[PDB]
């Protein structure tokens, strides 16, 4: 999930967009 | 629609706090 | 009024920074 | 007034995210 | 204090209400 | 830079103004 993927290394905008509806 | 945008930002944080482990499904008007 | 409500949220964030160890008392 | 002021707080938050290591000049 | 309580582990809504006037 | 100064220890308001224009 997003916390596991994005809370140690920074997620780019593209990576964050994977979590949109 | 800027005011609705700013309000929505604060609503998302409120849901984050109140929903806790339940999470929430957020959709735009 | 929601606009005042949102303003107050920013005010308490700002007071937290400005007041430091003094703290602050916020009330409606 | 303060509406622009509060909006600006959200704008600098948004630019911080969007601009990445490029950064921004506010 | 509140930092030693609610910044060492996440406080529930009930624990946060401790700080209301 | 501001990260090494102000994320490893708290910067006072006066220390923060040194990064203004
Ligand atoms: Cl706002
Ligand atoms: Zn706001």
Curated annotation (Swiss-Prot), chain C:
Q: Which domain of life is it from?
A: Eukaryota
Q: What is the effect of changing residue 24 to S?
A: In HPRI; Los-Angeles
The protein here is known as Insulin B chain
**Its encoding gene is what?**
INS
First and last residues shown, out of full length: 25 to 52 of 110
């Amino acid at each position: 999930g997003i916390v596991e993927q994005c809370c140690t290394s920074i997620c780019s905008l593209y990576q964050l967009e994977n979590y949109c509806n | 629609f800027v005011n609705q945008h700013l309000c929505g930002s604060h609503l998302v944080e409120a849901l984050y706090l109140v929903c806790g482990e339940r999470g929430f499904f957020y959709t735009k008007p």
